[PDB]
Nucleic acid binder design. Structure first.
Ligand code: ZN
Lengths: 104, 208, 99, 83, 138, 124
RNA sequence: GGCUAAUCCCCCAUGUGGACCCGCCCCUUGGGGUGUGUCCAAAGGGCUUUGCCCGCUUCCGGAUGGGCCCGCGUCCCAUCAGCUAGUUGGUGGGGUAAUGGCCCACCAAGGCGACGACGGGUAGCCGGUCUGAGAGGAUGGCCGGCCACAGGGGCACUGAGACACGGGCCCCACUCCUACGGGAGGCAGCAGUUAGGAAUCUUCCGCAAUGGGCGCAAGCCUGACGGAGCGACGCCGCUUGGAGGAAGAAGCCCUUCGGGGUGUAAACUCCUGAACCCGGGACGAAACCCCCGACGAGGGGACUGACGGUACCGGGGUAAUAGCGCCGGCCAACUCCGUGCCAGCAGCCGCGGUAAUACGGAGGGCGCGAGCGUUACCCGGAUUCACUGGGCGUAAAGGGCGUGUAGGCGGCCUGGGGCGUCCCAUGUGAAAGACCACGGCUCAACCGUGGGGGAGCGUGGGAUACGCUCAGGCUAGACG
């Protein structure tokens, strides 16, 4: 069975390709609490239909580019930036916490 | 080096009579008779309280030294006695009493245990028809432990059976003197053993 | 310290040449048939393609052209042709082209 | 070309074989496809050979040249007896 | 903020018995009630009823004890000797049926929560299900 | 630490420091002596102990202890090392295998022969 | 430079069929049907030679083996925090069995990182194995599976397959021949040599068995393998004897000098009889082959062992190795003498400066026994990194305080979804190992055969408390 995943398009800067945030939950191998990890999969939109903040299903497909082994299946729920924001702020915070120079 | 050395020295260290010589360990002299104090310059000395290990120790030894088996095999038995369902202690004793050499002792074909081993390693013992020289052989139930056709005319074995007219045989064993044979009926039960040991102390010993 | 298990090399040479004279054959003929469609030689273009299509499948008969290899070759040539002949329609012969 | 052959499993002087089905190119003591009965040279037990023809015929049917010795054993089993 | 309801419940019960109360109030809920259903059902407590506490719905849990002791300090054998949430938030511990735990050589109990209902170890095992292992009481 | 803490961070596993730099996990290692002193004990016990400098094949310069009522280890003798620190002799983390190489076994030993590298004295 | 055969090679025809373009029908990423056009086949040899065997060609299927790709899992350092330019994506083209920045051209400006990017260090992975009450820690040689290299780096050919340990081309380092132009080499195969090291074997036997290559077969090759040899390196089995025998020899030790101890130990009595000797002497091995039969089934006949004259059976037959650690506490085992903070012991606490159960010998004792100690290393004790199962007033430990980011966690009732979560069925979880049972070799180690168990994941079916989510409603938290 070809794997199917669910997530959110967080990147819309690429040609025919869309970045999908895919959240996964599971009990920790020793500490037992449910930890929530995640991953970005590069999908593949031929007709440039799927936009930012859309929840889509991913489906394992024939390799397409280096690192882009999935095609987009269908749309789940359009209109939900709230998720994307989270991705974005975390990115922003990443600009901080280094040895270049800290400010306010 | 499966031991072999001064015997009634152990009859002495344990304080309990150890039937290691058969005849004689019945005449005023298995040494315990008239000299119960242990060996050494210090035999006649007052003995301080034996630490927990100490007691567990000697109780293990008393057992081992009885069948006269090398710790190496003793240990192994205990190990395999623990893998069996049942009472980790009584099951021990079971195997112990399941030894070819030992059986020959109980069957009465030998004056003592020691003498029994030799009887086997020199091949005077049949088993279900074929001889056997390996004492560590475990007799299964319903085996025909006998005597070598050749060895029947023996000045020793002959003088032994003559004694068996009068003595009862272990409840789990049968023997036909008239034919110098004998069988192993079943694994004897603790309530069927006479040993002066305390299994529990032997088991305890192996958990240190 | 000689080994008669070098004859293989002694032979590989013979095949190296062998395959070579065949592949380069194709390359050339294809590259010939191609330039023709540019100018619009609807007659001889197919006359050459045909000589091509023949050579190709012939190399697949042996060890020269892997197998499906030949196939690529064929698809890559005919498709490259037809498209060109849009500049000057009407295939005179209609050899290597179904329609 | 998948064969059907033996496989050592006894020990020094205690040879115990395994009639099995496996690709030619693998070892004797290598990962087999489907074990189908065993054979004991010395024959210490009254039950010194077993086969399960049902499967044995599958293979030959599919195409699996067996060994000279192997075939021998399969013959005793009655793998090929068309009566 | 109240972070864990059930723990607060259990803990209101422990904290009471220790000082030997006849009864103890506790905010009510369609679950805390189900758990309490067991405590009574097993016998750790007399019982409980819905009570209006200042307009707010509460559960009066009726504590149970043992007889008055002899010699000195006659503080009665506690009926609920031990009680503690096994599964906590941020550490929810779920268990498979084959994995339901025996308590106190089977003397205490274990309250789970199955897709089939809030259960005891015994009942759970009988039903062939398992789930959120709520607490150990013995 | 909270179970979350235990997750973000995890437990630090204790690392063992080998009290023996004989480089390899080799039980012994040969070496040539350099200086053979007589170091004095620690605080409580006092006396005069026999010790030796040894340059190893691994390439470490160390101080080895020499047991026995007295040896015969000269300036450039080859020897063997087993290792075992000496409580009251600081810096002495190793030992000398008596009886191997150009190092001898004690004379007149009639006891713990297994160690010291003596030999079964033929009785008469 | 010249000759010449072939199942080597090439041309032409046939085309069952198959390939490519184009069109359509179905399907649904490059799957299948179909129509016109075009292109593509092939070798012969042997006999018991009018037929049978081997081999040949195209195509569909099978079987086995393998390429690529995806989810999850996969060590340490943050005194490594930002990494990236073919780099991320797109179009076309190349190339392959084939997807693909794999490669190229152009276009675009991306892609990854604290859920630790990049950098550094270290290390083949696993079935299993060691330990552990378990969780866990440690490990991955022997056997099995997967991967990677075959002096160092690069490259391709030929081929079903290689980028190819005992094939090739080039460069490099090394070693050797050299008429100094120029060459020849690769034991991480077996054995062996040397070096390094604490340390790791015989330049053995055999091709009988099992397997493998080539052959119609007879058969050839097979340091794959089956065997031997060497190493107490481990484990398991075996022996150095058994029975009798003093109120107790001698000698050695101890003494309160009367005696105790070594000690049934010896001696001596009898009995058995490893070694050793003679004789017999093996399974493993029945095929391919050959014959009858139809080269089918079925049946008959022949050959053939390295181990090895070994195992093993029969007969006879000598009483016939013991050692090492330890005896202050932990820890089973106590006296004399020597010594005198010396000599020395010592894991830890410590012992020793004239009375040493702790040094050195001795008697004696304990422990274990062809072994016993020692050092090294793994797990354990250590709930002393604490999931199980720890802590922070003064023992080491609350951040100098607040603010709030990401994150974690969250109140009552109702419903939907059912992701987590739980139950069921099913495929998988190779073999060997472990476990139980039965059996094999006089036992056991070792081995065989049969049974059972399992976490994890795939698919299907179900449940809905609790977590999650969506919806609606509340007011006890919060806020006004
Ligand atoms: Zn006696």
């Amino acid at each position: 069975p070809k794997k199917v995943l669910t997530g959110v398009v967080v990147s819309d800067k690429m040609q025919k390709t869309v970045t999908v945030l895919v959240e996964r939950q599971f009990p920790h191998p020793l500490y037992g609490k449910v930890i929530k990890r995640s991953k970005k999969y590069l999908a593949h939109d031929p007709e440039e239909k799927y936009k930012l903040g859309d929840v889509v299903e991913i489906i394992e497909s024939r390799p397409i580019s280096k690192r882009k082994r999935f095609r987009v299946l269908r749309l789940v729920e359009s209109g939900r930036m709230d998720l994307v924001e989270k991705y974005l702020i975390r990115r922003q915070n990443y600009q901080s916490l280094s040895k270049r120079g800290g400010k306010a | 080096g499966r031991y072999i050395g001064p015997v009634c020295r152990l009859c002495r260290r344990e304080g309990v009579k150890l039937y290691l010589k058969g005849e004689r360990c019945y005449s005023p002299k298995c040494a315990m008779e008239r000299r119960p104090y242990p060996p050494g310059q210090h035999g006649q000395k007052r003995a301080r309280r034996p630490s927990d290990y100490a007691v567990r120790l000697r109780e293990k030894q008393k057992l081992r030294r009885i069948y006269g088996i090398s710790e190496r095999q003793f240990r192994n038995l205990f190990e395999e006695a623990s893998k069996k369902k049942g009472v980790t202690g009584s099951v021990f004793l079971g195997l112990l009493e399941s030894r070819l050499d030992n059986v020959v002792y109980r069957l009465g074909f030998a004056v003592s245990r020691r003498q029994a081993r030799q009887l086997v390693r020199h091949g005077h013992i049949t088993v279900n028809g074929r001889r056997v020289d390996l004492p560590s052989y475990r007799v299964r139930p319903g085996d025909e432990i006998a005597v070598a056709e050749k060895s029947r005319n023996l000045e020793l074995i002959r003088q032994n059976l003559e004694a068996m007219k009068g003595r009862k045989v272990g409840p789990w064993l049968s023997l036909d003197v008239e034919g110098m044979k004998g069988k192993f009926l079943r694994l004897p039960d603790r309530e069927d053993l006479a040993l002066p040991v305390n299994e529990q102390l032997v088991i305890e010993f192996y958990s240190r | 310290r000689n080994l008669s298990a070098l004859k293989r090399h002694r032979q590989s040479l013979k095949r190296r040449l062998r395959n070579k004279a065949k592949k380069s054959a194709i390359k050339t003929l294809s590259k010939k048939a191609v330039q023709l469609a540019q100018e619009g030689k609807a007659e001889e273009a197919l006359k050459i393609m045909r000589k091509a299509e023949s050579l190709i499948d012939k190399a697949a008969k042996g060890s020269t052209l892997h197998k499906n290899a030949a196939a690529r070759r064929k698809s890559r040539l005919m498709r490259k042709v037809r498209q060109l002949l849009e500049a000057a329609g009407a295939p005179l012969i209609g050899g290597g082209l179904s329609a | 070309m998948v064969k059907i052959r033996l496989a050592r499993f006894g020990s020094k002087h205690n040879p115990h074989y395994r009639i099995v089905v496996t690709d030619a190119r693998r070892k004797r003591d290598g990962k087999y496809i489907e074990k189908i009965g065993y054979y004991d040279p010395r024959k210490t037990t009254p039950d010194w050979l077993k086969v399960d023809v049902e499967r044995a015929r599958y293979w030959l049917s599919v195409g699996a040249q067996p060994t000279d010795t192997a075939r021998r054993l399969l013959r005793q089993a009655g793998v090929f007896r068309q009566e | 903020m109240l972070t864990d309801p059930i723990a607060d419940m259990l803990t209101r019960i422990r904290n009471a018995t220790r000082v030997y109360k006849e009864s103890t109030d506790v905010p009510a809920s369609r679950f805390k009630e189900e758990i309490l259903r067991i405590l009574a059902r097993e016998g750790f407590i007399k019982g409980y009823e819905r009570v209006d506490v200042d307009g707010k719905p509460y559960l009066r849990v009726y504590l149970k004890y043992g007889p008055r002791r002899q010699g000195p300090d006659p503080r009665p054998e506690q009926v609920i000797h031990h009680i503690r949430r096994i599964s906590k938030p941020g550490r929810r511990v779920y268990v498979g049926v084959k994995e339901i735990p025996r308590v106190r050589r089977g003397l205490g109990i274990a309250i789970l929560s199955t897709s089939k209902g809030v259960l005891t170890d015994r009942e759970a095992r009988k039903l062939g299900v398992g789930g959120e292992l709520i607490c150990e009481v013995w | 630490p909270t179970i979350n803490q235990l997750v973000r961070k995890g437990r630090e596993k204790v690392r063992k420091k080998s009290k023996v730099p004989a480089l390899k996990g080799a039980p012994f290692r040969r070496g040539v002596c350099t200086v053979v002193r007589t170091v004095t004990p620690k605080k409580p016990n006092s006396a005069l102990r026999k010790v030796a400098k040894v340059r190893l094949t691994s390439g470490y310069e160390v101080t080895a202890y020499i047991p026995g009522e007295g040896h015969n280890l000269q300036e450039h003798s080859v020897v063997l090392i087993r290792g075992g620190r000496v409580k009251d002799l600081p810096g002495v983390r190793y030992h000398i295998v008596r009886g191997v190489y150009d190092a001898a076994g004690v004379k007149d030993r009639k006891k713990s022969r297994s160690k010291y590298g003596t030999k079964k004295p033929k009785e008469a």
